[PDB]
Design an enzyme around this catalytic site. Structure first.
Site, PDB file in Angstrom:
ATOM      1  N   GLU I  37       0.995  -0.803  -0.400  1.00 22.26           N
ATOM      2  CA  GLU I  37      -0.144  -0.069   0.134  1.00 22.26           C
ATOM      3  C   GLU I  37       1.059   1.323  -0.034  1.00 22.26           C
ATOM      4  OE1 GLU I  37      -3.085  -0.796   2.891  1.00 22.26           O
ATOM      5  OE2 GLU I  37      -4.141  -0.572   1.691  1.00 22.26           O
ATOM      6  N   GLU I  71       1.854  19.409   4.660  1.00 20.37           N
ATOM      7  CA  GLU I  71       0.795  20.464   4.729  1.00 20.37           C
ATOM      8  C   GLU I  71       2.009  21.536   4.632  1.00 20.37           C
ATOM      9  OE1 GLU I  71      -2.969  18.461   5.535  1.00 20.37           O
ATOM     10  OE2 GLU I  71      -1.738  21.288   5.077  1.00 20.37           O
ATOM     11  N   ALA I 126       9.939  14.695  24.886  1.00 18.40           N
ATOM     12  CA  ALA I 126       9.941  15.275  23.299  1.00 18.40           C
ATOM     13  C   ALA I 126       9.478  16.788  23.541  1.00 18.40           C
ATOM     14  CB  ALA I 126       8.698  14.652  22.209  1.00 18.40           C
ATOM     15  N   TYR I 130      12.179  19.515  21.814  1.00 21.44           N
ATOM     16  CA  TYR I 130      11.659  21.016  21.001  1.00 21.44           C
ATOM     17  C   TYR I 130      12.107  22.159  21.713  1.00 21.44           C
ATOM     18  CZ  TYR I 130       9.818  16.747  18.463  1.00 21.44           C
ATOM     19  OH  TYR I 130      10.256  15.571  17.300  1.00 21.44           O
TER      20      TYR I 130
END
Lengths: 169, 169, 166, 166, 169, 169, 169, 169, 169, 166, 169, 166
Positions: I37, I71, I126, I130
């Protein structure tokens, strides 16, 4: 006779083609494709719009009465050959147009497309039609035995021809 | 002797046969000269039933020749016959056997009514060979082909289903 | 003997079965002769359910024959039956066991009501075998098939799901 | 009465003939019900030669009925025949003259050898008319058609080119 | 049982699907499309490679022995439903894997895809299978009468369900 | 009363029927809400036989309602039934007549064996209407649909071919 | 010279075409389509595999050493014309093969395809090439002024022709 | 306000969409595709006729005056989310329709499609619009810094949300 | 450390990374679970510039992780950032280096203005990682994702082009 | 050094030349990054004549660099020129001999009138080399390219067919 | 006098012009004879820039004639010129004006270097007309065309860009 | 004066504006001459965002002129500008108000950094107007355009988003 004109076949003329194939009792072909109904013919015309193997000309008079049809099929440019056929409407079949239309077709074949040989097929049982073509310059080159199935029985057909040399001279 | 439907693998054998002919070869009324041109038109007409070809080979897979049936019309039940034996096995006497087995397929499987063929007038050996197999001349086409820089005549011989299946009865 | 769904690799065996039959072969009501024409026709109708074919093979997996269902109509629930055994194993008496399993698949999974077939008149031995398997004549089609240069009659025999499943 | 090749404009009359038949209608072995489904199926099979249909019309061009040839096989030279007359002109005795012209087209132009048809057993009047036109029974298909919630037998009658053309 | 792993179905696994449908006497479907041969399945997989209505997971062990299959079909994201099915290879059917594979499937349905209801169908004549699912949390919601034609006779099938609420709590 | 196969022209009548429902409407298992969305999916599935729909109209072309057959499986010989009468002619007593004529087509033309349908538990008037026509409950699907901000149950009722055609014998 | 053979161009020969266009400083065309790289040529060959406007023959010797190339372009079957071109590998340019290859090309054009006129173009500044063609039968029919842009400057080119009549007699 | 009606967007309504995007000084999107002219919008509508990621409803009154528009975009059925937007024609912006249209949109999202969360974006410099949504049930969940380039300068936008739980209770 | 544009050969490395995540993986806003896929959707969006992905590998071709930009809007000049380091090299301190080199490509090559990302609130390691690289929280999306059978919140952090390129000046 | 028409096999070398340039690479005014994206774009524009690229290689056939012609306009007879030499052989002084042969192909075969190019302002060494090859400045494009997080000026230099061919 | 690019509506005017010629008419090197054949090939080559045609009409829309540029090569910067004035306005002295305005477009807009044309030797009136406009004979093609049943010669005249734009300086 | 997105119905006005310009017209870097060729090219590039065109019309909706943005590059954020006013309203002094609104759309919605244009050297009046609108020369392209049988120089002027938006 001199007033007769030949014009390239258009889509609008397909109705005339359909009317001429009425009560002839032989399957009609369009670029070696069988058809019966007007819609089947219209599709085959759109398909072979671009094919060069056959050309057809409508025959009209001064007042644009549809007289008949002139067909060239099996056109080969390597051997320079083409099978000639002519169909005259029943209302004009007995007025002597045939002879002039035969010369018009030979004129287009031997003067523009520059073909070497024009052959045609005639039913053996229509000797008046054979003698006509002979008076026009054609001559027999074969007697095909049981070549066509016409009206419920195999029948012979005469194949007659004429070369570009004799017509131009 | 064994006849087999032509596969794509046999296309090279067809091209080789067309080398010695020195004539324009066709595939479903389409000219070709390169092996690749043949292979593409083969993929295009793999489904077309207008022509059917069989390759014959010895008992141990020695491809001998080819038999072709073209211009197949299932309404008139006709077809044009042709055969080409490789120059290697040309004069071994295999021709007549391939001809009869071709006419047998045409008249017993396809149920065709007439089978015709063409042969140049300048090769009477072939004219007599077919005449010995049941073929009869039905036409002497004048200047039908252009061979080696000159227009030549062609003989059209035919044989009927009734004769082939009922003559020895 | 074991039946298996027809695969693309078995098309070669199909072409060999049609090698010495002396009659035009069809694939979904479309003629063919060469293995290439058959392979393309199969890929074309690989999803068409109007026909179904099973290959019967030995325990050693040596292909023995073929069974076909054609003209499959799911509305009237009928289909035509055909069976071809290789000449190597034609007279080994396996024919009956193949006909039964075929009818089993037709009447147990696909849920069909009737199964008919066509057999030449000049081969009465096949007519008897089919009759002994459960089939009964329902028609004597006159000059329905053109075999060896002459039209010949063909018998149409049938069998209902009721007689096979009681 | 005059027969004419079926046009696209006549598909409306076809849909009306199938209005009150109480059986699934097919077009080239493909089911349909609505006029839109039929119109698309016709454009799809407009060049398929396996079937041919003619519309019979009066001198005033009032549509009277339909004649169809299906399962047309040019190898064995056979085809199935069917005729449907509108209820308005069902009992005017025109049926025979339509059957003859149909057989004429089959045996004079297309050059077919055999023509068969199927008629229900419970309608003997049609069996007689067909018999009087030249047809002869060749099969009694058992439970071949599902009509009105019950499987019914169907008679298959045939006629050869020889009897019609001597 | 704890060593069992679930993996997304790949093309290579289509052979395992074909082997499992042997001697089950029921037509196999792939996205509501019937199939029998390996080639027909492979085509249908390529076609519905992108469809979201069904998902399938192969069940393997530590040594990658193909244990069984987990299928979700009729997946609807508006009503949040999906029909669950499980197929265990005959060599592993009697080893108790079923229970864990049932929880694995419910886990994937109610924790990732976030579906509301999972329903399944069971033959009425396999009460041991029905009782199994009940012990797993399912409960009957319907007794479909003559819903499936199995082994030459219409048969009833139990439709049992379970909601996301009970599984998560 | 007269039933007619649905044409493209009747699509607007279908969209109007879906206005008062306030439920997600589908066309061959595909959602739609605009008349144009319906018309395109209609052109897409014009050939799909998985569903069949008939519009009923008065003697003088007053479209009354619609009957639908979906999930048609010709192997299991099943199908889901549904009917929607316009709010105008809702309580005129036409329902039962349309139901019987729908089951008549399913059991006498298509030769189907089973016909099932679905109805919300919160509308017992429909449950009793179908039960008066021969339908019997075979399932009580718990929280099957999401209606007006809540999950609700759905009744699945069925009727068999044998009963519909043999009960009065 | 007598050992030289002409063969229809195959896909495998496209590498030879590419090698010959090295250090010629003129854009190469394939059916009136520009190309430079081997891949661009291969695509154009696949495209025009079926076109009849041009034919090409590879020239080999007894030991199958690629000698040169023979091209016919702008082939028109109505007027029966074709532009002839010949390219000899640099290692064989000074061995006298040109004359025989010119007769081979004329032989194929006037004896098989049956063309009426063969014309060619020669740079005015290569008088040795012009005199060669004249000794082969060609004769000037035009002096195109600034027709070709060669090596950074427009240059004149001689158009010379020969008819089928003289070659056959 | 109670007379307002919502209808699925049709092709005919695309002119209203174009008129509303006049003098808004922000690029219009159709399924995340930019457009400006009516023709570009019409093409994009035909393309995404079938897409399920966005739904739109026209807002009309009793006399069918086009009031505004309701858009749902970025619709995800796995996470059950959708971005809500509302556009009221300038002639109806100051009549209090907004509040009812907001409840109509939430009603369709949380009662039919059964989505979990509805979020929207508001310019930080329109606090009256933010307070409106808060009075409707929304609450801020993010203050995107320099997210949108409006009228020649990057600007912040408030992202506010509301869950299905609170609306249904 | 070296970043390289993702080739089709690296798709398996992407699928392996998605094994441990236990979350629905997407490819251009399209779900996938099987390697096949993924490969098909890769061939479909090979030209789509809405997303760009880079695989990082050691000096001697040891594939470490992946960085993704989705995006991507070239009008607003934004993009969503995400990074996934294989569990093998997870805690080797490579993360921050890949992040900075990703933001460097976004702000110096693509000339983007804003880069945002998402992280689950239940993984503060996390969030701080960041934040140590320049990212700042701009939103606390409430019940944005459905993780392991529960709706959870998500933090949206951002960093601007001006800061990344001008802060040390 | 020998120039050769760009083949599909050389696309790998193209992808390597773009490996360390720190700027988006285009193929017929279409961006790309991966070797797969480039291979598909090449097959798409394999017949487009708006751009032409030659690979320059040593006598041993070791690839040295690349020369490109883009924005090819046959009406105004102009085209943009670009040259990239591998870092391995950047300072071997071969650059000039490559620029000349490129201009030779432009003005001797394609018959173009003008050839322009763009060079960054902060790299004066390239501006001098181009000037010494025959180019002359015709524009100082202000903030035309975004390089390393900052818009930078670019000089546009040109050369006519007349100066190269007298 | 005003020249205008040919639209599809003017195709009939082209067909009418080809009636009196009695020569095989072409459209992008493709023969045609019927108006429908022309219209289809026009839709096929609407984008082909190998030929360009302009229809000239009076001040009040009286279509006078046509000017054609074929065999346009933008590398050699050449093109073949031809003009056909309707028999109505044939001898009104409009020819030279249309010729100069055609050469003006070829030498000032397209920036072509050479323009050639062809004229039959048996019409010296046209030969002198072009010679009066700047054209000069560069070739006397022997038996180039087949006109009215005979092979005839054709004159090829040319004019250069430099002369047309610099002669009066 | 009001600007509107270019529709299919306005293509006729485009063909009229190109009626008397004496230079080849392009649509997305593709030549055309006839209204039919333009209509097909528009439908082909109706979704391509590399170019954008607005029609300026009076209060009575009488078409006055056209403004175009081409070579739109969203990476470097640049685009070429062109404006054509009908001869009827050429000297009505509306040109400036059109240039400003165009730059407004470029720098306020599309978020572009630079906007350049090309103006012939032999038309200094246009150079002054553009300069007075905010443009500044950045290049003197030598023999860049072939106008009326002779290559002519063209000035390239630019304007940044900063000067227009402070």
């Amino acid at each position: 006779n001199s007033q007769l004109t030949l014009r390239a076949l258009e889509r609008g003329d397909l109705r005339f083609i359909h009317n001429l194939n009425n009560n002839r009792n032989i399957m009609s072909y369009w670029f070696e494709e069988p058809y019966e109904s007007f819609d089947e013919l219209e599709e085959l015309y759109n398909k072979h719009i671009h094919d060069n193997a056959e050309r057809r000309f409508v025959v009209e008079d001064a007042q644009k009465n549809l007289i008949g049809l002139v067909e060239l099929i099996e056109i080969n440019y390597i051997h320079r050959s083409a099978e000639f056929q002519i169909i005259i409407a029943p209302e004009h079949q007995g007025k002597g147009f045939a002879r002039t239309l035969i010369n018009r077709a030979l004129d287009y074949s031997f003067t523009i497309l520059n073909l070497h040989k024009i052959y045609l097929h005639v039913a053996v049982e229509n000797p008046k039609a054979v003698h006509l073509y002979e008076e026009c310059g054609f001559v027999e080159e074969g007697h095909l035995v049981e070549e066509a199935f016409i009206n419920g029985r195999y029948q012979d057909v005469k194949r007659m021809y004429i070369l570009q040399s004799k017509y131009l001279n």
